[PDB]
Each structure stands twice: as structure tokens, then as C-alpha cells.
Design a protein around this ligand. Sequence first.
Ligand SMILES: Cc1ncc(COP(=O)(O)O)c(CNCC(=O)O)c1O
Ligand SMILES: Cc1ncc(COP(=O)(O)O)c(CNCC(=O)O)c1O
Lengths: 405, 405
Amino acid sequence: MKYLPQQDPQVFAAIEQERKRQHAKIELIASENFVSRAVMEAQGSVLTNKYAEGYPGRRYYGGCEYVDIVEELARERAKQLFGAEHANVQPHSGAQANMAVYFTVLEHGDTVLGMNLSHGGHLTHGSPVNFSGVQYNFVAYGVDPETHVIDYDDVREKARLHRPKLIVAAASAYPRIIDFAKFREIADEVGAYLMVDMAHIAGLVAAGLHPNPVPYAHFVTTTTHQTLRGPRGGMILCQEQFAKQIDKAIFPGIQGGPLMHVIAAKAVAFGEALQDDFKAYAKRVVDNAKRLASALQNEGFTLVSGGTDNHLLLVDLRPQQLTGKTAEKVLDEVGITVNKNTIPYDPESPFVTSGIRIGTAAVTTRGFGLEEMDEIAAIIGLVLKNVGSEQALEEARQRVAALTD
Amino acid sequence: MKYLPQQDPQVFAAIEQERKRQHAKIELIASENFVSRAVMEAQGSVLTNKYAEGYPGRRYYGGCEYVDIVEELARERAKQLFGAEHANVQPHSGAQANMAVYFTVLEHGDTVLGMNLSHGGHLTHGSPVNFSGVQYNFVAYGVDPETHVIDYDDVREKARLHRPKLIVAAASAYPRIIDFAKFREIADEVGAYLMVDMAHIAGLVAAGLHPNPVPYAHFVTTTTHQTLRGPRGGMILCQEQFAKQIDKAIFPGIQGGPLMHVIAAKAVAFGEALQDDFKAYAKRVVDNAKRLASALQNEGFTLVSGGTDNHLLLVDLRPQQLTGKTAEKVLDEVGITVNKNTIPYDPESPFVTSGIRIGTAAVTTRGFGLEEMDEIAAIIGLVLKNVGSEQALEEARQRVAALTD
Ligand SMILES: Cc1ncc(COP(=O)(O)O)c(CNCC(=O)O)c1O
Ligand SMILES: Cc1ncc(COP(=O)(O)O)c(CNCC(=O)O)c1O
């Protein structure tokens, strides 16, 4: 940086701490990642500077000839990546992407069927303190109490009983592959649309390591920032038939001027995902998650669903008599960042929980491999099995520091 | 830039064209501006990298110690700038700032009273193709047919008749000072909340050149990117009493994770606005707008309301027998960027219009003064009065190029 340090020492000092923190810690929050310098450079550009309500070639302001190229690069790279008939790269976030789809297909009060929020469903999938749950009537399907795998008979019984106008599939904390074909078969049975929110697994879908929802769903939403490793923002993919309605849901519907600088960063991240080394990266993410899962079970931990098929894992801490809140706090003391997270059928509230959610996308981006996963799991075992020992905590700290340099 | 040019030549070529375009044209769109390099550097930072749902010291993820400092710098600088009891710097845009206030105070179907959309009201103030107009029952107040000044007797009669739960004041195309004291007096008469959307005039308010709505309104919303000259995004200001409800409206209400890099750029722009040279800049904006207005009337143009009290002006092109659409197209041919815009009581539709909206915030940022305003007005007179002359158009092009270098 050149002008920030001189103009605003306070903000520059805080940003520099954040940068150093990102390097010094072991980032295991399942939704995080580190973007490339090219992505950052696109979002730190003068494209911030342009008003561009509307779409490429159909704007409400003049002078959009060059931002139109950037937006079209994003939309066409997206379509090449996911094979969708249409993309909308304007959503300001994963939440706005979902909000726009809901605004397109639902009337206030309509019934929506989504994944139980304490079994893996996201906040934007029906939480009563979220617009989704306030504006519409959400009903949920759950996972089997023993396998922790989505119970497709339960999805079907709930659909047939509640007759939702829309079915939402996908999650923020589900460690197994989702069967989009079964979701579409149920939606068709009851005449409902199907929306797949692939925010956590988009990068895996792009690399062919997770079945692609595009051929089965009427709408696919996502964050551009988690496994896809793009800038923070959203995207909607959909069939050509809903293209105009989705575009209008975004603008003049729920947003105003798009963030063109961020849309340029989206295109840059989409370009990176189209390359072969991103496919090799994604494979390492999934390979790393399996390794980590296996290594954690070697330490004595129980994992929700018994392991993982993607980038994430959920540790059921009941066997160690720990709440997710306690485990997150003590891991934070040694430099390991995780989230507390409810487990299916959790006896504890969402603010306490009986589990921790972990993912490997961030550490894989920094170069960690199978040997690092073995060490991280050994570190977590030492800490969580010896919570009252300051000597264990200090050793863990030194082992974390050896990993991060 | 260093990594973008090598990683993505396509996106870098388009961004570089956009940068050159920004320098070569005369930017008169009233909502645009150019941010500083320090603001851009903050948004091109690694803060993109952090999940930070929740608020400073009350986050749903660990490791937010340093982004909490950045967010608090933004909120405290905002409060120093505007004198508000609370600020929320998370809105992803002006639209989300308004959406969150509406989510806080209104139930679906509630009545809202806002400025007539063809008299200066914004799209997010009741358009029937916008969420505001789809979710709530908007009714409008207008400007006097001759002075084009808000008719406060009409605001009051509409309030008393329709009994709105909320009254919205402010606009996207109103060239005169708004009397927030009268709006608050009417809201109190009918027991309605008062929301002021100051997006276009925030920078003028900050510099003391426009009366501050903060002391009169329950809620104040704004874009951080127009006269305030910050990154693209929104902000809500409000009394302490609604603080918790507004925070919850934003998260877990209508958004998810905030853009922390953008919040850092907000703080940087707020720091710049707190300095004396920003006050001198704002004064030049208003001085420039008056000069430009006077110079355009010297050319024979009629201006809506007869001039301007802020950064913007509206030309009624009826006397020249031109639609805003035609004038915008021919100004675009010579390098001058404006927007077509309906005028109060316009006989033409919103897609054609009888006017052009112009503002001076962008050209003032690049250093233009009173002499430049005189030349721009002489250029617009030459073009709009000689629309079929290619010689006039070519001369205009050479005069624009002499201004932009
Ligand atoms: C499945 C899923 N969908 C939407 C969001 C919201 O995205 P945002 O950009 O934050 O508005 C998320 C968020 N996930 C964050 C996390 O799991 O840590 C999501 O997972
Ligand atoms: C008064 C007013 N309020 C909200 C917006 C929406 O902001 P955004 O960041 O685009 O969602 C605007 C937009 N103005 C743009 C223009 O007038 O050119 C506004 O004016």
C-alpha cells in the first residue's frame, strides 16, 4: 500500500494487524478462504467509480461500455464453469442472491421447504429472525438421527404434506454429498420449484468433485467467496426461462447500482477456477478434509455423519463432554479458528451447541497437505482432551506456530 | 497493478479502458464521484478475507479483533461527521440501507408517504417494480407546479389523509434544500416515523452546506459513494432508541456477512470528510453548481425550480423541443455524460423524459472551478441548440478534450 499508510495510519494499522493475523492463525472456519492478489487488485480498482444500474448493453447510465465487458466476462466465465443457461453476477452477497430468488418465485406468506437449521440449513433458509422466515412460511426436512444423512423420505413427506411453492436444497453445515436428482424428483411430484444454494460447495462443483445442481434446479444461488475462492459477494444461476425475471428481481427489484469493481473480481476468480490448477486445488481441499476427518477419528473424536464427502466436517463433542462454545474458545487460545455449530438433534441451544464446524479450503489455499492435516488433528486432540492443562495449551501454541511459520 | 495484468489480460484491459474513460469524459451524472487512492487501497485489501457476521465485540466468528477496530473507526467517524446517536456501516448499498429501515418499522402492506418519483423521489421510495412498492403501500407528495419546490401543504394533506406509518423525505433529483423541520412537524402531527434518505446530499450535510436531517429524523439512510465521496455502499444513522432494532434489521435480518474491506474504505472516506479540505471541496461543489446553473440560464436553458441550492440541477428541455433521451445521446457523442430524468409534471414517460439531470461533485473532485463551469455550459448550449450540426458537435468535442487534457 502507498497512500493509505500516510492518509489513515489508524485504518492502515488495523488492516496490517488483520493481514498478519491471517498468516499467524490456523483458519478452519469452513466458509473462509484467501483470495489471490489479482482478485484484490480488481476490487481495489476505479470501477468502484461507476454507476451501472441495469445490465450489459441495457444500462440506465451512459459510459458503461467497459464495465459491460467486465460483467460479460463474469457471466460467460460463470456459465462455462457451471454450465448454466444464465448467470446474474450482481448479487451483493449470498443473502441478496437468495433474497432475489425468493422475490422472484414467492408471494409474501408462501410456503417454502428447506433444510432444518439445526441440521445444516442456513440462516437465509427460514430463520424466524431472518427475512426468509419473516416473509415466508418455512417448513423443514431433517437428517436421519443416526447416519446424519438427509432423509429423502422426510423431504418427500414434508413436500407432499405442506405443498411448498419452492424447495430449497443445500446447506452451511452438511458434510455429505447432496442428491439434487432426488430433490428435483420430489419438487416435480408436488409441483414446486427447486432452488439449490451451493454457497459452501461451489468451488467443489466447479472442479467436478461435487455433483452439479445446475441440471436439476430451476435456480442455483451461491456466494462467490467460500470454496469458489472469489471476492465476497453472490451470484444466481438459472434456466433461460427465468432469466428476465431473475434479472428484474435483482434490479429494479432488490438492489440498486451493482458493485462493478467486485464484479470485476468475480470474473478474475472465475478465470482462476477455469484453470487446471484450481481443479488440483479443489481436489486437495476434499483430500485434506478426508485426511483431517480420519485423523480426528484416530484421536477419538466422533464426527457427524461419520466423516465427510466435501470440504467440511462437524465434530460431535458430546463424547468429550464439551460444548461447541467451550471448544471454540480454547482452540482460539492456541491460534486455531473454528466455529461452534449445532449438530443434528443437538440438546444444547444454537448459542452453546455440542459441536464445532471445520473446513479445509483456507489451509489448503495456503499450501497445507496431508501431513499438516495429521498435525492439526493431533493438536486439536491435545487441546480438547486436556482443556484444563496450561502445559498442553502452550505446547499446542508452539505446534501451531511451527505450522504457520 | 501488478498481478492482474499478468493473470487476467482481458479483465485488466477492460479496467484500464474504464480508467482512461473516466479521465477523458466530462462526468456530470449527479450521483457519481471519484474516490481517493487510499479508499481504493482499503477496498483492495485482505479484509475482503474475513467473515464477521454480527457487530464489533458481538461477532458470530472468532478472530474479528482487528476488523472490529476498522468497523468502530467507521461508526465513530460517522457519528462525529453527522452527530447521530448510532451508525450502522454494514449496508451493502443505499438500497439495503433503505430496505433495512423499512424492515425495522413496517409490516407488509403498511402505508408509506414519499416524494413523487417523477418529481424527484428515488426508485427505493415506492416504485411498483421495486421491493419498496411491492411490499408496502406507497403514497406520494409532490412539488408545486410552478416553483417546483416541495409543497409542504401537500405533504401534510397526504399524511393526514393516508395516515402513513412512515414518511420518507429526500430525493435523487431535487435541486433545492429540503426542510426536515417541516417534515418532522408533519410526522408528529400524524404519529408517523420520519426517515430521511440523504444519499445525494450526504457530503454537503457533512460540510455544513445543507441542513442536517439527523436532529429531525428517527432514521437517516445514505449511500457512502455520491457527494460523500466514499466507496460504493450504504449506511444508516438513527437515534439510540432504535439502535438495536436497526442492527438486527441489517443482521440477522436482511444481510449476512458484511464487506469488511468496504467498511474499511468507508472509515477512510469518513476520515477524509472530517478534514478541512473536504469542507472546502464541498463548498466548491455547491459554488460550481450555482455557477453552472447561472451559466446554463445565460445560454437560454430553463432549469427546474429556477436554479439550485445543492450539487445538482435539472434542465427542462421543453423550450428547446428536446427530450432528455435525445439530449443525453447527443451529449454522449461529444464526451459529456449526463442522465435523462423526468421533470415534475413531465408529459413524457420516464424512459423518454423532458429533462437531463446534472451534478458537479465529480468535476469538482477533478479540480474544475467556476471558469470550467462557464465553458461546460457554453459547450452544452452549442450542442443542444445545434443538434443536427456535425460541425457544432466536432467543435464541442475539441472543447471537451481541452477541458479534460
Ligand atoms: C448456504 C449459504 N447461503 C448463503 C450464505 C449467505 O452469504 P453472505 O455472503 O454471508 O450473505 C451463507 C453464508 N455462509 C457463511 C458460513 O457458513 O460461515 C451460506 O453458507
Ligand atoms: C436517495 C437515493 N437513495 C438510495 C439510492 C440507492 O443506492 P444504491 O447504492 O444504488 O443502492 C440512490 C441511488 N442514486 C443513484 C442516482 O441517483 O444516480 C439514491 O439517489
